[PDB]
Amino acid sequence: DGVGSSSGNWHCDSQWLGDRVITTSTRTWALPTYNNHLYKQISNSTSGGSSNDNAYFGYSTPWGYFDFNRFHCHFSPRDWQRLINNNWGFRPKRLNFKLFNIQVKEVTDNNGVKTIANNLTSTVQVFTDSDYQLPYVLGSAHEGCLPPFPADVFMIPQYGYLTLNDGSQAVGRSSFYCLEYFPSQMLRTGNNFQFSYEFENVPFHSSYAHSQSLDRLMNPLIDQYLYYLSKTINGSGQNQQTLKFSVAGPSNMAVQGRNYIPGPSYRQQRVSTTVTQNNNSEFAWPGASSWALNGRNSLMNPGPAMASHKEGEDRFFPLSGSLIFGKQGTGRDNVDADKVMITNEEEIKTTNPVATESYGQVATNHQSAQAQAQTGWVQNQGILPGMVWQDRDVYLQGPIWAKIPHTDGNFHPSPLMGGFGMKHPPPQILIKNTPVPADPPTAFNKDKLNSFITQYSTGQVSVEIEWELQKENSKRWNPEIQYTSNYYKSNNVEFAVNTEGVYSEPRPIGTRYLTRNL
Amino acid sequence: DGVGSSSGNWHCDSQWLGDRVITTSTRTWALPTYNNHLYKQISNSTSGGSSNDNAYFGYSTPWGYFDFNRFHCHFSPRDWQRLINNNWGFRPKRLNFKLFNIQVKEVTDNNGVKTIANNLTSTVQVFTDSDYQLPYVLGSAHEGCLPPFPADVFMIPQYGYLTLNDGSQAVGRSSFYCLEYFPSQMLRTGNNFQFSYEFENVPFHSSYAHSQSLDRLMNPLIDQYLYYLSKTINGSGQNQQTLKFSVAGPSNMAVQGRNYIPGPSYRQQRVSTTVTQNNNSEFAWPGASSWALNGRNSLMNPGPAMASHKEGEDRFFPLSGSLIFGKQGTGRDNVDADKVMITNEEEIKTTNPVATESYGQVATNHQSAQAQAQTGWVQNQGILPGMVWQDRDVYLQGPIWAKIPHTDGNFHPSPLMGGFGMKHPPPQILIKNTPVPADPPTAFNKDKLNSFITQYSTGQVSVEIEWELQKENSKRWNPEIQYTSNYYKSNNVEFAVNTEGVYSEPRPIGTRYLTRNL
Amino acid sequence: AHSQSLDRLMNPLIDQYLYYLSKTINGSGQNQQTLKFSVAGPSNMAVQGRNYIPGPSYRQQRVSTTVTQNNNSEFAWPGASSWALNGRNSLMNPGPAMASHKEGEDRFFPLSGSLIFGKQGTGRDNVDADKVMITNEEEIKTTNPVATESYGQVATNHQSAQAQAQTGWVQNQGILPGMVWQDRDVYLQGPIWAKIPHTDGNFHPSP
Ligand SMILES: OC[C@H]1O[C@@H](O)[C@H](O)[C@@H](O)[C@H]1O
Ligand SMILES: OC[C@H]1O[C@@H](O)[C@H](O)[C@@H](O)[C@H]1O
Ligand SMILES: OC[C@H]1O[C@@H](O)[C@H](O)[C@@H](O)[C@H]1O
């Protein structure tokens, strides 16, 4: 429209209908010029990397992008409480995105003194990758999200991507992408941008914990009509061999026949937060579970979903097998345990093997009169028919969706870090300040212009997501576990601003409070 | 609309119809950035407070708000005179509010020299809390009103609020509010804002004084048919006991039967403006009437409405029991009596007990041949059926409405400081300059941006209130008391500007001049 | 429950335009008398003018569940709040709704002023505190006076050059205009309705 008109309004609320929740978030952003308007080849060579496991090849772009892919972008802590205490499930449905009130600014420096002024004719350009033709970086859990607290102003992160490498080198199959080779909308102050998106059908996240365990599903009062082998010897001494059979029943539940078995396992090393209980060695990398791809070792960072500890063992956690969030102000490198927050998957204990335990035991031989029966431990167990499992829980600090990789086959493509896997996730939204040349020379020169006006932009972003709810139908008589604030006096309010103005999230909050039968 | 068009006009007049008055006020405001765009936890610890009675916990916000809640915002002194001399009652009916001609400005400092320029693309954001979802601070009598004199330019006050505390700490029941989590309208120069409001039904304020007193309502010429106990002894000496009864009549009015009794009382300590008549001790706090809430003592600052002094005792005033206004230029702390203006409620003397007197006397025992009759003084008297009272008078300097607290029960929820109590008062109007980041760094950083362009806004506000009038029907023969200016020569005109340009209000003006029968 | 208290409803950042009497003497010594006035503001919140005051009070005796803190006497009936009807004394068993204790004082409870439920299998007569369940009204602390405290203080005299200012404690306070209160909370074990007695008049007939 024009210089003097606002191109959009602040809309931050949430709206609870019967089976639907509509979250709306507005934030203020700032976009720098990245890479001096250049595309740059980057690799572990350009960054000085060494180990082959860390080698990479790729490109950094002048562009930047929006990430709303964490839940605290869309939910206040109160809204999150309201979701998790009342609902068995939820999934995203629709998306609405807006860019408005764009302001492009010019920075001039004289001597040690900078002046900022509006550049009214400068433009910002924006496009969504709707055909998913770019490397999708939103499914890796990155910084640069919209801030959880609506009054914070955030920097837009720089877009970059990786392609195939051999060491620091690239192969011929490596692909380079110019983001200028897409059509994009150009925006002066007074222009706005919007688009809508439909989430594809995704199952409801399970926001409940089971009130039954998979090995306890029997009627405790009644025998089975099945028999098991109770006794193989008639007693001490030579040549005592029998087959004795007993009814499996209430008194021996471990031996009863069952129709369903716990889900798959890939075993994690167990680490105690009580520190003297740990070995006196460096096992962090060496003792870690990992998978290998093309000679590279990638740590298996989230487990396949697994229970983080056994009952009462809460001090234990799987080495890499859980999500670790930092507290507010926690540094980058080598921080103590009290400065991070270790998620635990304890609720899926009912259907899922413990991350730090063997799946079970198998027979390793044929017994005989000569040979005793031998068993061995199953350290990793793939899918078996009859397995049943829960996915990893999702967190207010955590990711929402991932892009399912485009491949011939996948199994149960729920993202291992948690959330909703999608073949066509919310598309990437790319934004860039268009370069404005400084004064060119008065004689022609064929070289590309390397001299530009120093410039940055700011504005507002609205994200509106419609969420579908699955209500609790339970007949449970006794009251349930719910997420609560604690009444006891404290210097600060949890999930509130500091005395210095710093918003913090004191604890990770999962979704699983309400219960269901198994 | 656009940069070059005015978005509204100055409208300041008042319009007197038959039973309606419409006041319109326009002022010029300036809005700073508050708190460097931050929410801040505040408490008596952050301010250094000590006593438990003064302890608090709360938040200061970057937002600011409009307060038109004093009468001098809407009434010129002449209009006020015209209201109070001609009318038995008035109440507010409708409200219309406008923000227009917004100007956002940028401040740059080089060395000891500041330059102010327009920022044409910057925006201001505004919303009303229509659902009363925020702590309501307009019902406490605060500075920051629209100025009584239309040519004065005023600063918008900063919005803050308190929640539950224990000492300086907060409890889990304490609530934090982000004002960004409301939808608000964004305004560039050329955008304007308006909304309308309907006052809910409120009784007319009583702008009259009674021409009768509650104990004089009888016919002075005629006896009662009731009898009272005149004499209990037949004379001096032993064993003189009788019951003698007399007709209550014109000669003894104190003893007549009456149908209605004066309203409730909570006794205030009496202070003389003649200073040698006061005790030589510090009684201000120690001798003060107070109420206790959760171990805190709050001074009972306005009385329940009560008469400020007896007849001819005008030098006396209740310790806290009246409203005290400062004169123009009166300082903050420890000022002499001549620099303030002490309101008196003298007109309600007819139906209301004197603030500094006991309500009356009650029997404390059973008399008998052994025991003399004993009485005691009633220092505080709650509501009794048959009580009748007037509310506190309202003032041109004083507040208009309060928000009735949201509770299971209340009694006669007329605000004790005076005015119109409402469950849904005029809503809070919140305004903020939207933060404009300075130049961000060219490498991504996840920290919220703490560097902003220094900025402030100005504009105009219109408030239009429709007032309903209640005319005088009186049959009184003799002329009445009216508010007047005094003809005698003076250096300045009252309610006019100074020789230095300073507007002042020389006296508090109540509403009660005309009379009614009781 | 209220997230604000009735005495904290102000804007903490802004002064009042009202004044209060801060100082009555100019100092030590004879014949020091002044009237000094100050703005009520963020630093002194206790003295600010307010539009609404806490609800009515009828004072209850305070009993500690820590037993050595109680007096060594039988006060159960003798120290109890009561009302009289036709020469009969009825213990005032539920208070008019009032806050059961001050902050952090949870060990205290009003003598009769709260509902006491028995646990399962609790006997009829003279049972220990661990066999009953003492309700507390702590949430109404924001608008309601504490059951075991005085409502406040009133002036009992006229001060003068001869007489110092005297105050006295208000043990019971009836309704005043401008009072605001919460009703007693309701419980899963508790009653639902009552019949309002059929009478000429009643006030706020919440059971
Ligand atoms: O290969 C050895 C290295 O492996 C890395 O993945 C690990 O983070 C390092 O600590 C180091 O042990
Ligand atoms: O508690 C003692 C104090 O109480 C305050 O409310 C009063 O304003 C002070 O003057 C001081 O007397
Ligand atoms: O009047 C004296 C009696 O009063 C009763 O109401 C009380 O329950 C008894 O314990 C006893 O003290």
Take atom 9 of ligand 1 and give the residue whose Cα is closest: A285
Q: Inter-chain contact B279–C17, Cβ cutoff 8 Å?
A: no
Distance of CA A358 to the CA centre of its chain: 26
Distance CA C6, CA C142 (A): 6
Per CB-CB distance under 8 Å, the chain B contacts of A147 are 448
| A348: helix, strand or coil | helix
Top residue of B177, B181, B185, B430 to mutate, by most chain A CBs within 10 Å, is: B181
Instruction: Verify whether ligand 2 is closer than 6 Å to residue C32 (CB atom).
Output: no
- What value does the CA radius of gyration of chain A take, rounded to a whole number of Å? 28
Q: With contacts defined as CB-CB under 8 Å, which chain A residues touch B438?
A: 116
According to the entry, how was the structure determined? cryo-EM
Q: Count of CB contacts below 8 A, A vs B?
A: 181
- Nearest chain A CA: its distance from B347 CA (Å): 48
Provide the residue ranges of all domains of chain A, joining segments of one domain with +: 1-518
B158: its two tokens:
């900063």
| Ligand 1 atom 6, closest CA | A285
Indicate if ligand 1 lies below 6 Å from the C-beta of A51: yes
Token pair belonging to B55 = 């302890």
Report H helices in B75-114: 77-86
Closest CA to B224 of B257, B192, B201, B270: B257
Q: Whose CA is nearest to atom 12 of ligand 1?
A: A285
Which B residues, 435 through 494, put their C-beta within 8 Å of a C-beta on chain A?
435-446, 448-449, 452-453
Residues of B in contact with C180 (CB under 8 A): 404-405, 407, 409-410, 413
Determine whether the shortest distance from the Cβ of B285 to ligand 2 is under 6 A. yes
B51 CB near ligand 2 (under 6 Å): yes
Judged by DSSP in three states, A298 sits in strand
Supply B118's token pair: 């327009």
- Put simply, the chain B residues between 209 and 268 with a CB less than 8 A from any chain C CB are 263-264, 266-268
Element (H, E) at A47: helix A44-47
> From residue A180, how far is each of A133, A192, B296 by CA, in Å?
13, 20, 67
Residues A496 and B444: their CA atoms lie apart, in Å, by 26
Cα gap B408→B324, rounded to integer Å: 32
Q: Which ligand 2 atom is nearest residue B299's CA?
A: 6
- How far is the centre of ligand 1, averaged over its atoms, from the C-alpha of A285 (Å)? 5
Distance CA B198, CA B201 (A): 9
SS (H, E, C) A138-179: CCCCCCCECCCCCCCEEECCEEEEEECCECCECCCCCCCCCH
- The structure tokens 């998106």 sit at A197
Quote the longest CA-to-CA distance of chain A.
Answer: 109
Question: Quick check: B192 contacting C, CB < 8 Å?
Answer: no
Pairing outcome for strands A57-66 and A428-433: antiparallel
The answer to whether B64 contacts chain C (CB < 8 Å) is no
Beta-ladder partners of A26: A462
Match 């605001």 to its residue by tokens: C180
Domain spanning A1-518, CATH class: mainly beta
Q: Which residues of A touch B448 (CB under 8 A)?
A: 147, 152-154
For residue A229, what are the β-bridge partners? A245
B442/A211 Cα distance (integer angstroms): 52
Angle at A325 between CA A319 and CA A327, to 5 degrees: 130
| Residue listed under structure tokens 């100025």 | B147
Show contacts of B200-205: CB within 8 Å, 24+ apart: B200/B422, B200/B423, B200/B424, B202/B91, B202/B92, B202/B420, B202/B421, B202/B422, B203/B91, B204/B88, B204/B89, B204/B90, B204/B91, B204/B468, B204/B470, B205/B89, B205/B90, B205/B91, B205/B391, B205/B394, B205/B419, B205/B420, B205/B511
Burial of A78 (0-12, 13-18, 19+ CB in 10 A): middle
Both tokens of B119, joined, read 């920022």
Alpha-carbon distance C99 to A87, whole Å?
35
Q: Which residues pair with A252 in a beta bridge?
A: A249
Question: Which ranges in A65-149 belong to alpha helices (H)?
Answer: 71-74, 77-86
**Spatial separation of the C-alpha atoms in residues A223 and B366, rounded to whole Å:** 83
- Give the experimental resolution in Å: 2.4
> How far apart, in whole angstroms, are the C-alpha atoms of residue A118 and residue A126?
20
Q: Which of B13, B55, B62 is nearest to B37 (CA)?
A: B62
Mutate to test the interface with B, among C16, C159, C206 (most CBs of B within 10 A): C159
Q: Is there an atom of ligand 1 within 6 Å of A285 CB?
A: yes
Q: Please list, in sequence order, all residues whose beta carbon lies within 8 angstroms of the beta carbon of residue C91, skipping any fewer than 6 positions away.
A: C77, C80, C81, C82, C112
Show Cβ contacts of residue A429 under 8 Å, excluding neighbours closer than 6 positions. A65, A66, A97, A126, A127, A128
3-state secondary structure of B83: helix
- Of B308, B241, B247, B244, nearest in space to B273 by CA: B308
Q: Contact at 8 Å (CB) between B183 and B127?
A: yes
Q: Does B50 touch chain C (CB under 8 A)?
A: no
8 Å CB contact between A63 and A91: no
Closest CA of chain B from C53, distance in Å: 8
Could you say which DSSP state residue A118 is in? E
Residue in the block written with tokens 């038109």: B68
Is residue B23 within 8 A of residue B74, CB to CB? The reply is yes
The bridge status of strand C57-58 relative to strand C62-64 is unpaired
Q: How far is the CA of C149 from the centre of ligand 2 (A)?
A: 20
Angle at A491 between CA A397 and CA C101, to 5 degrees: 115
Residue A385, CA distances (Å) to A260, A263, A355, A389, A408 in order: 9, 10, 20, 12, 22
Q: Give the list of residues 6+ apart from residue A116 with CB closer than 8 angstroms, or none.
A: A105, A106, A107, B108, B438, B439, B453
CA distance linking residue B46 with residue B40, whole number of Å:
10
Verify whether ligand 1 is closer than 6 Å to residue A377 (CB atom): no
Token pair of B343 as six digits? 């309101």
Query: Quick one: CA dihedral B143, B145, B150, B154, positive or negative?
Result: positive
Q: Are A501 and A467 in contact (CB under 8 A)?
A: no
Q: Could you tell me if B309 and B316 are in contact, meaning their C-beta atoms sit under 8 angstroms apart? A: yes
Ligand nearest to the CA of A298: 1
The size of chain C, in residues, is 207
Query: What DSSP designation does C140 have?
Result: G
Handedness of CA A40, A42, A45, A46 (dihedral sign): positive
- Which tokens sit at C54? 């806490």
Which two structure tokens, joined as six digits, stand for B282? 């510090």
SS3 letters across C14-75: CCECEEEEEECCCCCCCCCCCCEEEECECCECCCCCCCCEECCEECCCEEECCHHHCCCCCC
A277: phi then psi, degrees, rounded to nearest 5 = -80, -15
Name which of B54, B157, B281 is nearest C164 (Cβ-Cβ).
Answer: B281
C204 and C196 Cβ atoms separated by less than 8 Å: no
Only one residue has tokens 């040549």, namely A239
CB contact under 8 Å between C21 and B281, yes or no, is no
A50 lines ligand 1 (CB under 6 A): no
Spatial separation of the C-alpha atoms in residues B426 and B65, rounded to whole Å: 13
Report chain C residues whose CB lies below 8 A from the CB of B413.
Answer: 52, 177-178, 180
Secondary structure (3-state) at A367? coil
Other CB atoms closer than 10 Å to residue A375's CB: what's the count?
A: 11
CA C114, CA C91: separation in Å to the nearest integer? 12
Angle at CA B475, nearest 5°, toward B473 and B477? 135
CA angle B362, B367, B373 (to 5 degrees): 50
Between strands B360-363 and C57-58, the pairing is unpaired
Contact A355, A381 (CB under 8 A): no
Task: Tell me the torsion sign for CA atoms B449, B455, B460, B465.
Answer: positive
Q: Which residues 1-20 in chain B show a CB within 8 A of chain A? A: 1-3
Identify the H or E element spanning B72: helix B71-74
Q: Contact, A513 vs A480, CB < 8 A? A: yes
Burial of residue B416, with CB atoms counted within 10 A of its CB: 0-12 exposed, 13-18 middle, 19 or more buried: buried
d(CA B326, CA A215): 79
User: Coil, strand or helix: which one is B180?
Assistant: helix
Residue B45 is inside which H or E element, if any? helix B44-47
Encoding tokens for residue B450?
Answer: 């703490």
Residues of C in contact with B47 (CB under 8 A): 42-43
Q: Is A211 exposed, middle or buried (0-12, 13-18, 19+ CB in 10 A)?
A: middle
The DSSP 8-state label assigned to residue B84 in this structure reads: H
**B 328-357 → A contacts, CB under 8 A:** none
Reading the block at residue C138, the tokens are 């702590």
Which residue's alpha carbon is at the smallest distance from atom 11 of ligand 1?
A: A285
Name the nearest CA neighbour of A101 among C80, B187, B88.
B187
| Triad A444, A448, A454: Cα angle to 5° | 110
The answer to whether the CB atoms of B173 and C3 lie below 8 A apart is yes
CB-based contact B170 A10, cutoff 8 Å: no
